E3 ubiquitin-protein ligase TOM1 (Saccharomyces cerevisiae), 450 residues
Amino acid sequence: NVKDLQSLYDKMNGGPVWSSLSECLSQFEKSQAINTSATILLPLIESLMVVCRRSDLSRVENLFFPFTDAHKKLLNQMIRSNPKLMSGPFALLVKNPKVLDFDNKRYFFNAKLKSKLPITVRREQVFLDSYRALFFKTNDEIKNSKLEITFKGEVTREWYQVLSRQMFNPDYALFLPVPSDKTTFHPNRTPEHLSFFKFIGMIIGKAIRDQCFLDCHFSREVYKNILGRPVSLKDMESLDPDYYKSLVWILDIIEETFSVETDDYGEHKVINLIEGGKDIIVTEANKQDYVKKVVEYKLQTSVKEQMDNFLVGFYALISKDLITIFDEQELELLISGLPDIDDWKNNTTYVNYTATCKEVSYFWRAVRSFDAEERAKLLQFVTGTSKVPLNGFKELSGVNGVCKFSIHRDFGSSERLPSSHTCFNQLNLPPYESYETLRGSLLLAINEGH
């Protein structure tokens, strides 16, 4: 049915109209003198949303993305002025989250998702008291109930933040510091830790629902899993230990096999990635898949039951279809507010570059034009986290700590996309002939990286 429908829409030869539309919208974006509105063409845009809704979102089949990506700056403004458009024919935009701005995305989220429970708990042991009091209660009761917390010896935001601080303490072993990223935490491969993870998911979902910003940071893989997104090789770079570091060097010098060595509470154990993992030799013929299996073990299959319990506990308050719209970077901001982000401008170092260089000046100008959310996204892209350290940016941590930002010139063509390494808080910028090209490349790199 869809094939003939798209064939019909093509038969209308509306291309010339669509192109023409793309012209006038551009003028509306350029001309600030106009006073009437940009919504006079709203039905036409809606029509473009009807000739693409049945197409493959993942001519009349290669028009949605190239148009929305071009006119995001106007569509976001339109939605901001009239958010109800999301419930209308503009709903198809959710199928391309890259265009919606974070504020609009979160407003629509809260609108969809959001369509007394007194308790007494010890301040020090608030975690266990809350776990006993709430985890056993009904899902809907807690979901629709507002907490009235009471510290033993003395009313929700403080409880949320203190619980977040206590939940991820290494003492409980639930979350452990990320090497080279001491600021954040990663889940644990290693009594009732399962119910504790379920409660962690429940409380995180409740914090999302209550707009309370938990001042906590999790690894990239955690947020990729909560969104259901796949896991890439670069992810272990956040927590790539010595074993993971040698994987890059190997990828004949080492007689690698589909096997892993682990030290579980004083016991040496071996993990087989595939049948005969120890026996099956690793070679150039089976390395492209060896790396994939290694990352899968490192990130997904090593924490199977715990992550499943975490996901089911969190999803009780938020549906997967709701949170799917957000991206990996955007979840950091959603959970723990937006970092503020001057000192970062001055507390930096350059390799094959200088503060007064044309490329460096253009980069600084582009960064300055970025907003708070865009600056937070850039910080997440560069350092791998969206939280400024407790002190100025000069105090950035690292493998050995005190690792500050360092930019590095790239000798590739201007078409090259700037890269980064969060482990060293390192950025790699190519020279750019024009400021606009540099800005576009930076925006594409930060947005498409996740």
Observations:
- The longest strand covers residues 181-187.
- The beta strands are 117-121, 147-151, 175-178, 181-187, 259-264, 267-272, 348-351, 405-409, 419-421, 426-429.
- The radius of gyration is 25 Å.
